[PDB]
Design a protein around this nucleic acid. Structure first.
Ligand code: MG
Ligand code: MG
Ligand code: MG
Ligand code: MG
Ligand code: MG
Ligand code: ZN
Lengths: 85, 104, 66, 85, 52, 105
RNA sequence: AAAAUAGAUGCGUAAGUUCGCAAGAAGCAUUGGCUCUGAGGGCAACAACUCAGAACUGCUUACGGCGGGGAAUCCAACUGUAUAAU
RNA sequence: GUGGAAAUGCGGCCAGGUGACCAAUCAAUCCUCCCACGGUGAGCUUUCUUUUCACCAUAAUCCACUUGGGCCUUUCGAGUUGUUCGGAACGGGGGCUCAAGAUUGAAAAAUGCAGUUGUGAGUUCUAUUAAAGCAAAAACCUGGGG
């Protein structure tokens, strides 16, 4: 089964070029990865449309990033709001 | 036995499902298969779950159904899951009890 | 913390579905609550925890005996 | 169960017992399948299909060339009167 | 086609179709809406209402 | 240690969820027929809403056994006909104004 | 243009490569009939039909259907679209 | 209005639901097909053929009442063909309830047909791509409140 290298990208066969797959592959996996829920303490988030992350556990929906539940930009804003508290 | 449509419509759309039926006369006859609906649900924002005491009556027959066929005899009975009611009965009580304390 | 030695020292119920019931009986000798608890769930143990005059420690776990 | 054939309306005594088979073998009639008569009653402990006797009859009438003269029918649950047109 | 089961109801209830069956004897009471039927097993009570 | 009799509970299940109720009898020990602690519970089967207004002030009451987990104990504290008057009149006095105020879910 | 390849099974499969491929690469091989065997389940206290094997035996290599392959260069990366009527 | 410890059972406005939205697959029935049995009719019949063929039907409507899911309650395993799940309650006992379904019967044998069930298969209907997320609304329903 397992690909030596390209995983989810294996479906694309020998096309689209190596780099673009390499770069699609990161976003592709975080996109289908289950991302950690602060609410449940559970890996549980899964995306259901770009920027939408349903929680498999407690019904819920974080907004979040496209291919990832949290943007690096967002890491700043949340604490920065915490510090203003 | 090959069958053909009997209602004036002739497309294999979802609302026109048909049931093949051997008859007492030994005909094989398509019959309209009812457009079953899923029944009452708790609201979509509350996870959208099928309610327990309620039947999936088509509104075509929902008018003729007994009232309790579409509900339970509990507050929010045809609307909310029992947990969802209890979520409120708690949330009503506990939230007011904190407000009653914020006067002190 | 010290509640870990509690695990071997004595009894402990776990989870709100029965940590609340140790709390009605007042069998509860303490009640830990992880931060993760939703506020209306957590308030509910927080409210029994007042009626039982049980010790409360925001950190669900209840230690009936120890 | 005794099968029968009411010939009374219109050899055939003989042809049957030579041409009936309690198992694979033909014409070897064990005491458990006695036959005889204007009715070829066929007594048996054996599990024959009833229409087998409607069959040996037609296979008989096709020999005597009667089958376009006369016609078998189940006039009872366990009988075959031989009629006509 | 609802089926009335007990006799007490049936004696309470236009033109009625008796139907003998082997091992049966139905009484198909027609009415404005339903064709009520009353099954009646043993015959001793079938004509017990038939002669009614 | 507080499901003491006279304690008022708000029912959280059945037809009567959201209804207030004083515990009457309370038996915390599990029964051979009630594998659960089960308070008796008179309740408001109808909160209150010259004789033009009198029907409106009538209080309903229900006596019931109830599993402890199917009602909510409160801060507050306090034979279907007999129970009905002792917090009918208890109402007319206004000793427990909140008790005869129903929850607004 | 025609021929040619051809199904399935078991083997075997190069360069090059974006490591997915190339690949059905290529390349040999066995295949019928028949009489048997073995394997693979269900429900209590009878049901499939695939695979496998074995003898014996047959061939006129005897339906239909079914890739020809390889080595290179140019162009375009790819699937796609598109001058209906050169 | 009312039973039930509970899931829940029976008897103006406001908010929610149905409408209402997926390929497949899996499962049930449906259906078709096959087989086995049995009947009935027909046909083959030089020979052979316990044989070949056909048929053996069950409408809506209603009444009493196994599989999948949700839930109540009570005292690491669970799970699928499959990418799951579990103290935010898993499993086990009992219960509730939905969705299909089965059987009991009413229809309905006064019909059909012509001079029987069961068993197997297929069909049927009831995730993935996604920077793609896969209509609306009347009707209607239920509630909260009056
Ligand atoms: Mg050519
Ligand atoms: Mg290589
Ligand atoms: Mg091109
Ligand atoms: Mg052109
Ligand atoms: Mg029917
Ligand atoms: Zn979560």
């Amino acid at each position: 089964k397992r690909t030596v290298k390209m995983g989810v990208m294996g479906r694309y066969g020998a096309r689209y070029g190596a780099n673009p797959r390499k770069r699609a592959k990161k976003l592709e996996v975080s996109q289908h990865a289950r991302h950690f829920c602060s609410f449940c303490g559970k890996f549980a988030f899964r995306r259901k449309a770009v920027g939408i992350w349903r929680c498999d556990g407690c019904s819920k929906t974080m907004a979040g990033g496209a291919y990832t539940l949290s943007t690096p930009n967002n890491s700043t804003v949340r604490s920065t709001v915490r510090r203003l508290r | 036995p090959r069958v053909q449509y009997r209602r004036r419509m002739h497309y294999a759309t979802r609302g026109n499902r048909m049931k093949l039926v051997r008859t007492p006369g030994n005909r094989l006859v398509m019959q309209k298969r009812v457009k079953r609906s899923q029944g009452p649900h708790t609201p979509w924002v509350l996870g959208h779950k099928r309610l327990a005491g309620t039947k999936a009556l088509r509104h075509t027959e929902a008018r003729l159904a007994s009232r309790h066929e579409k509900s339970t005899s509990r507050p929010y009975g045809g609307v909310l899951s029992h947990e969802q009611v209890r979520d409120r009965i708690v949330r009503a009580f506990l939230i007011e009890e904190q407000r009653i304390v914020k006067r002190a | 913390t010290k509640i870990q030695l509690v695990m071997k020292s004595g009894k402990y119920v776990l989870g709100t579905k029965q940590t609340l019931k140790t709390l009605r009986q007042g069998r509860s000798k303490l009640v830990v609550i992880s931060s993760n608890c939703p506020p209306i769930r957590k308030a509910e143990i927080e409210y029994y925890c007042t009626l039982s005059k049980t010790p409360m420690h925001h950190y669900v776990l209840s230690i009936t005996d120890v | 169960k005794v099968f029968k054939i009411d010939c009374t309306i219109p050899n055939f005594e003989q042809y049957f017992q030579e041409n009936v088979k309690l198992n694979g073998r033909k014409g070897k009639l064990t005491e458990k399948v006695r036959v005889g008569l204007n009715v070829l009653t066929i007594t048996t402990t054996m599990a024959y299909r009833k229409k087998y006797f409607k069959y040996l009859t037609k296979k008989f009438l096709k020999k005597k060339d009667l089958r376009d003269w006369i016609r078998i029918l189940a006039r009872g649950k366990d009988t075959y009167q031989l009629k006509y047109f | 086609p609802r089926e009335i089961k007990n006799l007490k109801e049936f004696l309470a209830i236009r033109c009625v179709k008796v139907k003998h069956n082997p091992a049966q004897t139905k009484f198909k009471v027609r009415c404005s809406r339903y064709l009520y039927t009353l099954v009646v097993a043993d015959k001793k009570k079938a004509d017990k209402i038939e002669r009614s | 240690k507080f499901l003491k009799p006279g304690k008022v509970v708000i029912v959280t299940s059945g037809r009567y969820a959201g209804k207030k109720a004083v515990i009457v009898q309370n038996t915390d020990s599990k029964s051979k027929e009630r594998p659960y602690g089960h308070s008796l519970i008179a309740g408001m089967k109808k909160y209150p809403k010259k004789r033009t207004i009198q029907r409106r002030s009538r209080v309903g009451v229900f006596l019931r056994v109830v599993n402890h987990k199917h009602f909510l104990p409160t801060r507050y504290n306090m034979s279907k006909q007999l129970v009905r008057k002792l917090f009918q009149a208890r109402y007319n006095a206004g000793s427990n104004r909140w008790f005869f105020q129903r929850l607004r879910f």
